[PDB]
Amino acid sequence: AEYRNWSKPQCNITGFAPFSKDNSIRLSAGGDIWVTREPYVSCDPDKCYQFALGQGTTLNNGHSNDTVHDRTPYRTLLMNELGVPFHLGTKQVCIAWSSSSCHDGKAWLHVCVTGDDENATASFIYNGRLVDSIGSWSKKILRTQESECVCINGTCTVVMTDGSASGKADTKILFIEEGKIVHTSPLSGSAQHVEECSCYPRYPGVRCVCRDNWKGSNRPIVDINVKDYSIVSSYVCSGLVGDTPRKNDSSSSSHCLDPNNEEGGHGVKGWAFDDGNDVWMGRTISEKLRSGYETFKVIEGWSKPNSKLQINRQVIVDRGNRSGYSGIFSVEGKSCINRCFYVELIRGRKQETEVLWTSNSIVVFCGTSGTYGTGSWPDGADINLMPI
Amino acid sequence: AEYRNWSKPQCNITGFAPFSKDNSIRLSAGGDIWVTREPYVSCDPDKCYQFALGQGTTLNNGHSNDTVHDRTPYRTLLMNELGVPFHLGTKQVCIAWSSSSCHDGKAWLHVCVTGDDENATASFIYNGRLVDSIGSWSKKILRTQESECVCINGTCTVVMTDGSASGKADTKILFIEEGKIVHTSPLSGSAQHVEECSCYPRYPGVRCVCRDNWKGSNRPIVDINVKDYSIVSSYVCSGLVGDTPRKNDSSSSSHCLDPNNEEGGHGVKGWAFDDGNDVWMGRTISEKLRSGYETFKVIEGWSKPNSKLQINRQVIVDRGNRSGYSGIFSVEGKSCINRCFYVELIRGRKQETEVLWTSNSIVVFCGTSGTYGTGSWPDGADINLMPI
């Protein structure tokens, strides 16, 4: 076993093909299945795993009531092979109401945050043992990616924020070797608010596309140099912007440097990645709600400020059905590194009042250089057939 | 780990001996078990797995209502070790409402088709990662074997059809190396309609027996040359024909070249294989319905047009009990390659109206050169004891 370096070119991308779906809410109506949110996917060199933050209960269970809240002492990070839904034999790998995980080629790192809002603890678990921990630096909900971290040559990097959800906060990038924090760098650059980064290897460094919860409906970019620990940041150039909420497609804009100040407050975790001067990106179909999910390429949308020339659109979830968070993960092939993404399909409160719980299922697609058709792969549960 | 070449002679066959049964419908009345259809079996060099297309729900679950339909965005391919029934810890390996899987000696290939009827996508997943995809070529339900594919020296082959279920369609044979499509050949020869092929290694090539849904109650044969990609096809010679529906044994016929035009419309997935000039084949016992299941040898039934001289009959499922699809898989022994088959035992709608769901169990037999007795191994559930 050798460390991963991810030193292959990005695969050619013509769009995305279906990869996995867990159907977990449909299963929850006839089976004991965990209540979750904030899912993601990350793969070791052989095979992929699905992860999510449990709510310390199954769905058909009195403890599923009022699971809309994001942070409790009962949330744990669940980890199963991809496509195995979160049944009662699922391993809870750490105590977490925010997390990130990744494999360095040799073993798994988990970054797990729990405890009081004003004084949380992050644990750093590597190859099955606690190696490091830190306390909150700004006393305002220390929190992290909710998707995979990225490791090159044994140095894993993860983005964390502590501070306001609606104003200037303190973001830092940690560099971790076999579980030990070896350096911490503050965020630098023109991104003004950074949360929930979706990061990917872009050898020789790591590139992240994030959520600006304050003034941007355009997504921040954070670039991380793992050799010298330097950080740069800005915003995706595309005038078709990636956050929710956002303005409509004719009114929206980005010019790469600053938050657009267009319905910038609040947001949703999402992703994008560059392909030469173009950008591939996903977003909800609704501009206001976490409903629908579409991907497309914006021609020159990485390099040219405010480009809106899209092509190669695919519907992942039709506009009539619920989506949620989405994130990137990367998979090493024989000759190239592929990009894949998952979509959280949130069901229950507050939007759906027939039940008292909040949970989700997942759907997952991977880049292809081949061809594909059309469809829609929503959660699929009938809210009226669920236990309350 | 080396690629499989299957370069051993076929084992001697005197008939078939019991191998596996999962009892899944009986278990579903007191346990959380997936709703399935279109099951099959395929083995890696060590051990066998059962697969089937899930319906995105367990049976005792409101979402099992009206699971008679064949294609939805919730169907996934399930994969367990053979004899482990589809419980909630079962892995969903891909999104699929049609599939085929096989192991090349090194890793698993899955061919998984999903999305809109008029514009489906097939994903090609190998060693746990998406390697290729194609879109529908004829915009009319791209679909595949619903049983194992076959790999020689690292080149796996799979038969797919796109086009009418009741007239000329477009069948193609794909050749796939570590998940990458390297060649596609159109069907050639005198088979006029080919679906749901049951294929087996017949070194140096692959031989398939299929379903003609249009004009044949005799089964098509497709022979695939993996070295030069050439294809030949025709029909099993036996006058005791393998499809359902079919005429009775005195009225039925085949003369090897053409569909017989005898109750040829519709059909069921099945199998046969040659043993010198003779053929071993399975079929439903009923000529009209998917009820009962029998195997026998037809003397000269591979080589002599319209031969009806049977011997070595075995009842697998008595005439009074339900069957379904059946397919072949092959298993490498010390000195020879054995042939085995499974039978899908379908329960529920439309035929049984006491319940609202449709699902199945499996029973599996393998070739023997020894001796054996008699019996009947049906699904065994009492429809009146099931959840509706």
Added chain:
Amino acid sequence: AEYRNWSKPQCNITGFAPFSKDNSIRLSAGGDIWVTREPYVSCDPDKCYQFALGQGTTLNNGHSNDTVHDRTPYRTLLMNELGVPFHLGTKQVCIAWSSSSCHDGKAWLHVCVTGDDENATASFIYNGRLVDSIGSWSKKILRTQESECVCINGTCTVVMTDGSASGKADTKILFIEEGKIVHTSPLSGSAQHVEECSCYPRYPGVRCVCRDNWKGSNRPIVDINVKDYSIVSSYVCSGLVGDTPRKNDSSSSSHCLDPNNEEGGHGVKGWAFDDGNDVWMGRTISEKLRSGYETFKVIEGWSKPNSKLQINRQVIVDRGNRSGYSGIFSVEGKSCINRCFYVELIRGRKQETEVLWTSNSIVVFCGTSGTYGTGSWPDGADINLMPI
């Protein structure tokens, strides 16, 4: 991986110490657990497994009604690591209403009998594939040990009977190499009726203690020579006899050569083994019913006709609680081969009428050369708290 030869001396035995218990009936009242009977234990060189014949259903399930019957097409052999109760993820390794399994050092052999009473089939599965099969030789319930077989230097041996349960039958000993039957020898010697043998390695051969269902309440012995295939048989010498039913301890007898003709009809599977001239044996405490379970040594009870001098008694299950079958298995230690046994704890019909099902749990003890105390480890379920 090398073949086992079992060429170490028997361990010193002072009695038996607790090893495993599964509590499966207690668990069945609050969990989905298989209905079973005829359990046993067998270990590969690393670890032990529990096996039993399923009844194709869980206990809290309408299909558990009238599971008293011994042979149906739904019975399968279940196999889990020892101490893991038969939950819904349990593997059904073959179709069987009679079975025997054993590991030769390299892989598992399963001998699985199913089908019609008058014309059964035995399948021989080795390293996960069907290698051989035979049909019934006497058309009267071909049947086998219901406990582990034994392999020396790659040759596994198993005892099977076909014929009357209440008169002369046809017993044969099969010799099987990597799943292939290489020789079959008829029973020879003075045992007059032999069923359900509990066999153990006694290098250079195999020694079995069995059930005489016809005229003996003393247990038969069958000795098997694996080099030349010769067979000898007789009866355990001990005047404290091992079957149920039997006469009381003052009236019972054995003189080593013949069935005692004392309450000889019917019987229960059990075991014994020699220790020099002495014998270690288990039996039910009741002389009429499968209730209680005790072990003891009979001084000179292997060599001296009708010896009744017992010592080192241990109660395993108190007289007030139900037992069932019991069998031997052997485990290789650093310097010696240990002997262990399991006891089936049968609950439900016909004896207990509060429920409609019949099932069992297990308890398991292993030889020790150390010391121990006293106790009683019965099934423990309260029949009045069970689903009917």
Added chain:
Amino acid sequence: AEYRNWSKPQCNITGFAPFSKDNSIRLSAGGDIWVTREPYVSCDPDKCYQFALGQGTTLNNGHSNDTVHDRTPYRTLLMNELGVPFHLGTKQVCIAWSSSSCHDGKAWLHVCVTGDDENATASFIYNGRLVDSIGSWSKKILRTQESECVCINGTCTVVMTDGSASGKADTKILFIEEGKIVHTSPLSGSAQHVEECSCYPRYPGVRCVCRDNWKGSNRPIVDINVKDYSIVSSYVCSGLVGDTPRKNDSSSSSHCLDPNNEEGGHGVKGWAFDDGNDVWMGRTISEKLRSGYETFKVIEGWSKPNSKLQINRQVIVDRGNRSGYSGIFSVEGKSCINRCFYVELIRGRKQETEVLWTSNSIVVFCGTSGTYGTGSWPDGADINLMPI
């Protein structure tokens, strides 16, 4: 695979960071989960496992009634990877109503005690086989640590007691090599009553902190020399004492040599360990009840009689919530040996009368040399939402 020697220095400790939590009582209200008590954690060189003594039943099950009792023939030791809650696929590794387990670098040892109070048996199982057993030496509930044993260079040591819970008893330290007892030493030194020791490697020997159930609310220490089998004992010096019950912090005392005779009767399993002259220790927050849980360092609390100068306090479970037993386990890092602890969170009878059962969940923390914040991680079930 080599034997562990634990010959690295203790890691620096600044306090403890969250490691694992299983949420098992919350899950039990909507899932089939074992009833347990007396849990602990122990790790092989790769990964950690959670263990506990089952009560032979799940919680939503009539057999969970009156599970307050500590010893029955149905209790077994359960073992899962850490964070996997005790679902129905959990392995019961031995019959036990008292236990200890540990891995020597090569394989697992389990010490399992069961049977009659006045004449119990301890089984010693190593690498999956029974290797040794002993009977009760004093006929008064032979019993052991209920947490991990410790092995150096292949010699594992375990502390056991037999005798009164409220007066002089007979404690012995056993030394076990690949499952075989090679030496037994009696307790020696000034500890007057020793139960439920929490032991850790302190190369070249083993150090334990225990429970005095007779006259001490200060905890005993037992030091074990694995080379010459000699034993020394005394009491933790800290005037902030570790048992429950105890006097308040101003009235309590210890002077290192003798039991303090302060609310000394009864007790709870707990732990402490030295860090130079200082001691790190956990205790319940309540002085009378098993409620709350806190850890802190007592400056000079290892070396200076009656020191009460605490620093670095952390709440693990707030004062308003239930705790239970707690124990130490040790984990080998790249350069140092870390200390971790678990807390049993007991729910149900006798204290909570809304239900008829008694069970627990777990929470687990590991030493850190980093930083951390604050929180509280209690069991979290709502007693009014549980099955009775």
